Design a protein around this ligand. Structure first.
Ligand SMILES: CCCCCCCCCCCC(=O)OC[C@H](COP(=O)([O-])O)OC(=O)CCCCCCCCCCC
Ligand SMILES: Nc1ncnc2c1ncn2[C@@H]1O[C@H](COP(=O)(O)OP(=O)(O)OP(=O)(O)O)[C@@H](O)[C@H]1O
Lengths: 77, 93, 54, 65, 132, 44, 17, 285, 105, 49, 48
């Protein structure tokens, strides 16, 4: 991956690109399904981490814990 | 003692499917759920288009602003509904 | 034993079992295959961290 | 829309933080007049009004009941 | 991106993606091909960030709902248990066998265990208990 | 409901008087002499 | 996609992964 | 048994051949070039494949073994194959009024279900006298269905293209017609089904609401639905032709029903029909 | 009884009101009896995880109401009282077909 | 000795649940950050020597 | 009483004992309030 094609070589670069280019493959990216996947997968990875840690904690503790007007009726009796 | 946790949880669950009182989020959730249940029944939807029902609620500071925000949002969504972000198709070409 | 319970109404005195709700584990399966690539990445990083600990 | 989402996120984040703190602490832990005045303490919800106003016949014209 | 409407073959319309060069304009004009513009609404660009930020809001909202439910459940159970531990020793105080218990005695006991085994499944459906 | 908004001069306008009559005719609520005669000799 | 390097740098990248 | 081992070997061989055939179909890029060559008509895969399911469920219901989903699919097959298929065939793009009238037709026909479920236990047919329900010769029923199809295809053919028909304040009358139709039909249904003890056994004579305007209001409402539909794609000629054919068949069934309930009731429906002579359209017929 | 059972999501069996099935067993000819019987039958049908109330559920709900539990269970030891019960119940059934009969024991 | 590690693990599980919520919260807002654009660099912040 | 009828806070059975069941009121032994009746009799030969 080439570092920092600065701003404006293109007027020359595409002048010199077309002479040597045989096959371009541009990886145009979508944005909305990408963000949907990213947030869902982040929830998935953190939920899987916490599920594993819940199971580990409950088993480890369930194992290690068994091993460890006021003087009327008081004057005549 | 684990069964008492489930007893308390299911008691709270049944009280959620009621209208005693809870957080405003859950009350609004039950509100929109019963609104959808009203809208989906046709035998319910038949007697809503007469002005007596609306009049019995209109005459009985928060409701006014909460209704006018819907008005300004509706106007803005209708304004966004028509134009194109670029305007001159030819001068873009 | 000896009791006064008719034989017709005996089976009515027991509690039947119930199938668990079948749907949430298919929900989990679908939500895992939607993010299966992240599951593989996290499993690999888990093994790497465990081998670094070991 | 960004401000709406951000305010919702801030309130829900504080709610989550305080809920987690109270959950952690709690898991570390292990006469007719007053009852007739409190029948309807608050007014009925508008959704409840619209639910109750549209009642129907509900199985009168059945041969069984 | 590109959407052509080509003059021979099948299918007649394709998709390509483009790197930006002036000579694309030069060749497009040199061929002499009609150029138009596909213009959208604003609502097509306005649901972009809305749809892109809907699911995370949904997830954190479910988190807040379930956590709030669990919090109130734990608080209610803890209050009930602590009131029990306070009442064991302070209030009205608290709490041969088999020979006198024979016949139609266990026929009530089984019902009274399976009715308090889970009071929800009768009281969620408004079905009452054996009251007396 | 709609008697609270309507003007009084529109309430007593002849157009309103002839509105009621064919409203009654359309509903078939025309009360006649013989109906009330059978009613009054029907009561006790 | 867009990486956030500390001191506030948003770097654009290739497709993903 | 040795024959079991022989048949296991044969089953293994034929399964190997079938799996090999499937695999060499799949991972061949040329079958991917030719089998993805048919995605252009993914709209036409569904709209015809569902028709076979509809007709199969129609035959199954004709035998007498139809669940609720299959009969729903039968009316769905009729209604979809009516509304959406012809303009999709003629212009190649469906956007606008055909969608909402596909919704409106289903919203229309699911109105006997709600009334006959609310004041009832369930959708099961009850026991009644055989002479109460009016029948009508099967050829006329098929002719009615075929004429309805002919008029709908002719409506899609006749009407201008979906982008040339106007909007704005000209599409507000269409909404008025839709809402007034569904009000009249629901009122007529609610008035008719209230007085019947069994599924169709009228105890008395109904003369209320739409019955004090038109003697047969459900029929008129149904035709007015098709009239508004022919107004939607702007095809008046089809409107007139459905007027003719629907009027003919529907008047035939109205005459049969009317003579039955005049025989069975007598003077009451006689003076009622004297009160409202106009049988289908207000003061037009 | 049918309306009290239907409102809670319990589908009553279409063989005892579609026919003369449970007409010959039900009584408690007053209020507070149908409510208690419905609660008992619904509890019993809940114990088996069912949504349909059969005639046996109604019979068992009625038997728990019109019978008293007793320890030191004993039966009749000289038959002939059984013959009296048999003859009286037969004469009641064949002649008076508009009155129910409590189960013989 | 077992109670101490039990307490540590019990703290850790709820801390992990908290982190699981927090990371989603931060990922919601990580999408509205951009490198500031000028006229000389316009956000790329790289120019010819 | 100020409480919901159907909840965990109502799972209470009223247990009562007496020696003369014929001295009780009809409205208390009325169905719904008292559901089950158990008569515990005196023991027998082997039990004695
Ligand atoms: C979904 C419901 C099925 C829609 C069925 C519509 C349909 O069959 O239309 C075919 C037309 C295209 O045909 P052609 O003349 O382009 O060959 O194709 C279409 O116009 C399909 C439009 C499909 C809309 C989505
Ligand atoms: N099955 C038994 N085994 C042992 N002791 C018994 C048994 N049954 C009764 N008793 C004796 O009976 C006494 C208690 O009687 P109990 O209190 O049950 O009578 P009661 O049913 O309360 O009568 P009442 O209702 O008139 O008070 C005890 O002191 C006990 O010794």
């Amino acid at each position: 991956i080439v570092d920092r094609m600065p701003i404006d070589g293109w007027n020359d670069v595409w002048k010199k690109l077309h002479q040597q280019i045989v096959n371009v493959e541009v990886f145009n990216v979508d944005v909305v399904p990408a963000e949907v996947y990213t947030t869902v997968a982040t929830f998935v990875v953190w939920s899987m981490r916490l599920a594993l840690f819940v199971s580990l904690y409950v088993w480890i503790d369930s194992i290690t814990r068994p091993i460890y007007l006021g003087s009327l009726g008081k004057s005549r009796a | 003692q684990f069964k008492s946790w489930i007893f308390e949880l299911r008691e709270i669950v049944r009280e959620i499917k009621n209208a005693h009182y809870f957080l405003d989020s859950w009350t609004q959730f039950n509100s929109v759920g019963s609104f959808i249940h009203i809208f989906f029944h046709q035998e319910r939807f038949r007697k809503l288009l007469d002005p007596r029902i609306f009049s019995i609620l209109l005459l009985r500071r928060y409701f006014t602003i909460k209704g006018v925000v819907l008005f300004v949002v509706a106007a803005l969504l209708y304004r966004i509904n028509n134009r194109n972000m670029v305007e001159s198709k030819n001068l873009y070409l | 034993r000896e009791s006064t319970m008719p034989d017709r109404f005996r089976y009515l005195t027991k509690e039947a079992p119930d199938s668990p709700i079948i749907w949430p584990w298919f929900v989990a399966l679908g939500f895992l295959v939607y993010a299966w690539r992240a599951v593989l990445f996290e499993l690999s990083n888990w093994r790497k961290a465990a081998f670094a600990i070991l | 829309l960004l401000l709406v989402a951000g305010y919702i996120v801030r309130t829900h984040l504080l709610f989550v933080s305080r809920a987690y703190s109270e959950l952690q602490t709690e898991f570390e832990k292990i006469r007719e007049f007053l009852v007739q005045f409190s029948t309807l303490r608050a007014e009925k919800r508008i959704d409840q009004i619209l639910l109750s106003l549209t009642h129907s016949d509900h199985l009168s014209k059945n041969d069984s009941g | 991106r590109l959407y052509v409407t080509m003059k021979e073959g099948f299918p007649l319309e394709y998709i390509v993606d483009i790197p930006l060069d002036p000579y694309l304009f030069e060749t497009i004009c040199n061929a002499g091909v009609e150029v138009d513009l596909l213009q959208k609404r604003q609502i097509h660009y306005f649901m972009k960030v809305f749809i892109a930020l809907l699911p995370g809001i949904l997830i954190l909202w479910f988190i807040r709902e379930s956590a709030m439910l669990l919090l109130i459940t734990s608080k209610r159970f803890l209050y009930k248990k602590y009131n029990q531990l306070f009442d064991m020793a302070y209030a009205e105080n608290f709490i041969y066998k088999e020979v006198v218990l024979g016949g139609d005695v266990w026929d009530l006991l089984d019902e009274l265990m399976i009715y308090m085994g889970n009071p929800m499944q009768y009281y969620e459906k408004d079905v009452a208990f054996v009251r007396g | 409901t709609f008697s609270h908004i309507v003007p009084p001069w529109l309430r007593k306008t002849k157009v309103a008087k002839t509105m009621g009559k064919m409203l009654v005719n359309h509903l078939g609520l025309n009360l006649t002499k013989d109906d009330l005669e059978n009613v009054v000799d029907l009561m006790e | 996609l867009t990486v956030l390097i500390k001191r506030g740098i948003l770097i654009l990248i290739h497709k993903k992964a | 048994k040795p024959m079991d081992v022989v048949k296991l070997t044969l089953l293994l061989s034929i399964l190997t051949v079938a799996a090999k055939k499937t695999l060499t179909l799949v991972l061949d890029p040329f079958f991917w070039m030719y089998f993805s060559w048919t995605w252009l008509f993914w709209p036409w895969f569904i709209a015809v494949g569902l028709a076979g399911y509809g007709i199969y469920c129609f035959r199954k219901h004709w035998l007498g073994e139809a669940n609720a989903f299959e009969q729903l699919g039968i009316v769905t097959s009729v209604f979809t194959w009516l509304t959406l298929v012809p303009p999709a065939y003629f212009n190649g793009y469906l956007e606008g009024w055909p969608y909402v009238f596909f919704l409106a037709y289903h919203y229309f026909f699911f109105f006997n279900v709600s009334v006959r479920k609310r004041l009832y236990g369930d959708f099961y047919a009850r026991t009644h006298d055989p002479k109460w329900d009016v029948n009508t010769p099967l050829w006329s029923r098929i002719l009615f269905g075929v004429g309805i199809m002919v008029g709908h295809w002719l409506a899609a053919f006749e009407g201008p293209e979906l982008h040339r028909l106007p909007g704005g304040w000209a599409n507000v009358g269409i909404w008025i017609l839709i809402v007034i139709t569904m009000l009249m039909h629901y009122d007529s249904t609610l008035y008719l089904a209230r007085y019947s003890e069994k599924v169709v056994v009228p105890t008395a004579v109904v003369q209320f609401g739409p019955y004090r305007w038109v003697r047969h209001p459900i029929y008129a409402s149904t035709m007015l639905l098709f009239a508004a539909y022919c107004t939607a794609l702007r095809a008046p000629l089809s409107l007139l032709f459905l007027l003719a054919v629907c009027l003919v068949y529907y008047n035939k069934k109205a005459k049969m029903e009317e003579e039955l309930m005049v025989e069975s009731f007598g003077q009451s429906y006689s003076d009622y029909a004297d009160k409202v002579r106009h049988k289908f359209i207000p003061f037009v017929y | 009884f049918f309306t009290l059972s239907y409102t809670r999501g319990f589908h009553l069996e279409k063989k005892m009101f579609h026919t003369n099935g449970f007409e010959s067993i039900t009584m408690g000819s007053s209020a507070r009896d149908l409510v208690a019987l419905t609660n008992e039958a619904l509890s019993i049908s809940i114990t088996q995880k069912k949504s349909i109330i059969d005639t046996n559920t109604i019979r068992s709900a009625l038997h728990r109401q019109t019978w008293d539990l007793r320890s030191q269970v004993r039966s009749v030891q000289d038959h002939g009282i059984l013959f009296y019960q048999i003859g009286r119940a037969v004469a009641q059934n064949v002649l008076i077909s508009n009155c129910p009969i409590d189960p013989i024991s | 000795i077992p109670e101490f590690i039990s307490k540590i693990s019990y703290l850790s599980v709820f801390a992990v649940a908290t982190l699981g919520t927090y990371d989603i919260a931060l990922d919601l807002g990580k999408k509205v950050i951009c490198q500031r654009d000028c006229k000389t660099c316009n956000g790329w912040q790289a120019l010819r020597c | 009483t100020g409480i919901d009828r159907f909840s965990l806070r109502q799972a209470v059975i009223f247990i009562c004992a007496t020696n003369r069941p014929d001295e009780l009121d009809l409205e208390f032994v009325r169905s719904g309030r008292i559901d089950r009746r158990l008569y515990i009799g005196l023991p027998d030969a082997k039990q004695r």
